[PDB]
Design a protein around this ligand. Structure first.
Ligand SMILES: [Mg+2]
Ligand SMILES: [Mg+2]
Ligand SMILES: [Mg+2]
Ligand SMILES: [Mg+2]
Ligand SMILES: [Mg+2]
Ligand SMILES: [Mg+2]
Ligand SMILES: [Mg+2]
Ligand SMILES: [Mg+2]
Ligand SMILES: [Mg+2]
Ligand SMILES: [Mg+2]
Ligand SMILES: [Mg+2]
Ligand SMILES: [Mg+2]
Ligand SMILES: [Mg+2]
Ligand SMILES: [Mg+2]
Ligand SMILES: [Mg+2]
Ligand SMILES: [Mg+2]
Ligand SMILES: [Mg+2]
Ligand SMILES: [Mg+2]
Ligand SMILES: [Mg+2]
Ligand SMILES: [Mg+2]
Ligand SMILES: [Mg+2]
Ligand SMILES: [Mg+2]
Ligand SMILES: [Mg+2]
Ligand SMILES: [Mg+2]
Ligand SMILES: [Mg+2]
Ligand SMILES: [Mg+2]
Ligand SMILES: [Mg+2]
Ligand SMILES: [Mg+2]
Ligand SMILES: [Mg+2]
Ligand SMILES: [Mg+2]
Ligand SMILES: [Mg+2]
Ligand SMILES: [Mg+2]
Ligand SMILES: [Mg+2]
Ligand SMILES: [Zn+2]
Lengths: 110, 43, 53, 122
RNA sequence: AUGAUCAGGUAGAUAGGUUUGGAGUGGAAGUGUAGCGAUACAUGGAGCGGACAAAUACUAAUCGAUCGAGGACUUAACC
RNA sequence: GUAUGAGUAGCGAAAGAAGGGUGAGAAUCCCUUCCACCGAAUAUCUAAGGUUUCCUGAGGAAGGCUCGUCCGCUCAGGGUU
RNA sequence: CCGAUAGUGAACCAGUACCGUGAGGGAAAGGUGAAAAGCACCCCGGAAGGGGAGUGAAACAGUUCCUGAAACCGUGUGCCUA
RNA sequence: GUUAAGUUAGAAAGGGCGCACGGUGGAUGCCUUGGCACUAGGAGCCGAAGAAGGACGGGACUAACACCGAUAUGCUUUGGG
């Protein structure tokens, strides 16, 4: 009935990936791929690979019709954070968060 | 800006080296203290 | 210069109402049937106005 | 007219370089604003080449760059971009009154999202 | 500022080019003549001329797609 | 440990352009041409200080205020008479 | 008597890493499974990472791996709201 | 049917409350390799026949620990197994 794919600990901040994942939800898979291709953000290639992986393993493992799928749900979750520092004036240092994210997409019929 | 540390191999050896520590009773006292604490680097 | 009070979750979510982004202006190619932007060359066949580019 | 992010002399140098590039290669890829300026520049150059006399040639020589297009065996002698403009490109449009270039939109650049376009002399 | 506003998208003068102009500057290049030369004169209000004016479909406004009504009840006047 | 400020301040003096190549991927790596900057220096030696940063072949997790196919970064072999 | 913020500073290559010219100061960091049986093979992807298949009592035990609270970040929805 | 006067629904760009399912994070429980305080006994010094503490080396492969010293991951002998 359904298939899913996940990408774990991708080095991209969750907000910047959510802003793109929002406009793929509940769409036919071909339209969603086209939408991702023409959105000039840095999160589009990662989500495109996750979505195509989900379509591929739906086709292979469950023998579903790859021409009648829709994006059932897509979401972004927080992964572990890399802690860095930036030298500021007067001899002090400030914190930097290099955040990562887990990206999940699910596809199904109708 | 000229800062406080201006390195010199010879000056470092002559002020803080092993043979300078061994030449006074208080230097050998420093060496004994650092041996008692167990430090890997003496002088 | 400095925030007097911390911001609540509801206030932050209200301010983030308009920080979404739009949906691309695309349609299907008359030649190859693929999706493409209007007034742009088709990247899948190199067509524009029904001619090779 | 457009200031293209740079001072007067830098803008003039950029325009001269791009116009010579379009004359030599006849089809280049660049950003949209630069294309919309070299449109004007290159078409004025082509009109000067169509006029054909020595005054027009000396005026075009104050803007075109001194670059080699090719070497031709005739003692092998090189051909320069001014010679190509006056001898090859200008006679091509002897029966067309205006509009010697066209602009074709391509899409955003990966590094900075700039809108890239193709400009060719046709 | 960006949105917005207004003028248009081949039922086309919206922008650029082109052709004729205009302001502005002041007499182009090449050639010839005079002079030993610096230079002067002629061809000739010449040449050039962002943003200003009018003509002209040469170049780009191609081709698509999306949104958007079927009109609640009561009473009173007419009908 | 994790928020708010907030996708906000900043991204550390400066001229770049196009054409070829490589590659899963190129404003950022390689090559060509044109342009620009220093030039009692932003050139060449050499003390101190550092201690393998030097060369070659592979690599792209982290570091590099962006990207990276590149690197004073990672790995393996060398190199100083 | 303590049970990993406790008990030695140190249950782990600790007077180490790191800081300081120096004398000197001085950390953090335990737990797969009874047994590696540590996932042959197929599929998407450059890889990372997944979906199956297999091992096992358990993989929602998959080499920071027993349990897995709260802050904090999300997706869906019953009732309310310009 | 039109006109006039009056009444009442519904809505979500977003938000609130409840619930379900996840992520991050490391509390809690269980556990122990390491500690703390003592008791009985032993022993209370090593060095010019070179000490305490170190540096550099020794392996088929050897960065670190442990062991050993150019007889170097060890040699002789007496017992145990
Ligand atoms: Mg004394
Ligand atoms: Mg403009
Ligand atoms: Mg542009
Ligand atoms: Mg005049
Ligand atoms: Mg913070
Ligand atoms: Mg280039
Ligand atoms: Mg190194
Ligand atoms: Mg970095
Ligand atoms: Mg930065
Ligand atoms: Mg490569
Ligand atoms: Mg290297
Ligand atoms: Mg614990
Ligand atoms: Mg175990
Ligand atoms: Mg066990
Ligand atoms: Mg592949
Ligand atoms: Mg794999
Ligand atoms: Mg469990
Ligand atoms: Mg378990
Ligand atoms: Mg949990
Ligand atoms: Mg929780
Ligand atoms: Mg709700
Ligand atoms: Mg509602
Ligand atoms: Mg609405
Ligand atoms: Mg909504
Ligand atoms: Mg809520
Ligand atoms: Mg409420
Ligand atoms: Mg709530
Ligand atoms: Mg709740
Ligand atoms: Mg967890
Ligand atoms: Mg906690
Ligand atoms: Mg005792
Ligand atoms: Mg080794
Ligand atoms: Mg011997
Ligand atoms: Zn096409």
């Amino acid at each position: 009935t359904s298939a899913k794919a996940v990408a774990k600990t991708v080095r991209i901040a969750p907000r910047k990936a959510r802003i793109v994942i929002d406009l793929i939800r509940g769409k036919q898979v071909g339209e969603a791929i086209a939408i991702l291709k023409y959105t000039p953000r840095s999160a589009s290639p990662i989500i495109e690979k996750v979505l195509k992986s989900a379509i591929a393993n739906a086709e292979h493992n469950y023998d579903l019709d790859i021409n009648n799928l829709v994006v059932e749900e897509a979401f972004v979750d927080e992964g572990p954070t890399l802690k860095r520092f930036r030298p500021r004036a007067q001899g002090r240092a400030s914190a930097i968060n290099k955040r990562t994210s887990h990206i999940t997409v699910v596809v199904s019929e109708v | 800006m000229k800062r406080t540390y201006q390195p010199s191999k010879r000056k470092r050896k002559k002020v803080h080296g092993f043979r300078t520590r061994m030449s006074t009773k208080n230097g050998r006292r420093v060496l004994a203290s650092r041996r008692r604490k167990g430090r890997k680097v003496l002088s | 210069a400095v925030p007097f009070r911390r911001t609540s979750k509801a206030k932050k979510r209200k301010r983030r109402t308009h920080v979404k982004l739009q949906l691309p202006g695309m349609n299907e190619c008359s030649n190859c049937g693929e999706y493409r932007l209007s007034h742009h060359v088709c990247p899948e066949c190199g067509q524009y106005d029904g001619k090779d580019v | 007219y457009r200031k293209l992010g740079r001072t007067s002399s830098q803008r003039k140098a950029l325009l001269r370089d791009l116009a010579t590039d379009l004359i030599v290669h006849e089809r280049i890829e660049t950003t949209e604003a630069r294309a919309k300026e070299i449109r004007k520049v290159v078409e004025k150059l082509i009109t000067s080449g169509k006029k054909g006399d020595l005054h027009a040639r000396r005026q075009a020589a104050a803007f075109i760059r001194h670059e080699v297009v090719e070497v031709v065996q005739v003692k092998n002698r090189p051909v320069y971009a001014l010679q190509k403009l006056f001898d090859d490109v200008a006679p091509r449009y002897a029966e067309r009154q205006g509009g010697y270039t066209r602009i074709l939109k391509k899409g955003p650049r990966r590094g900075d999202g700039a809108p890239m376009v193709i400009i060719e002399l046709v």
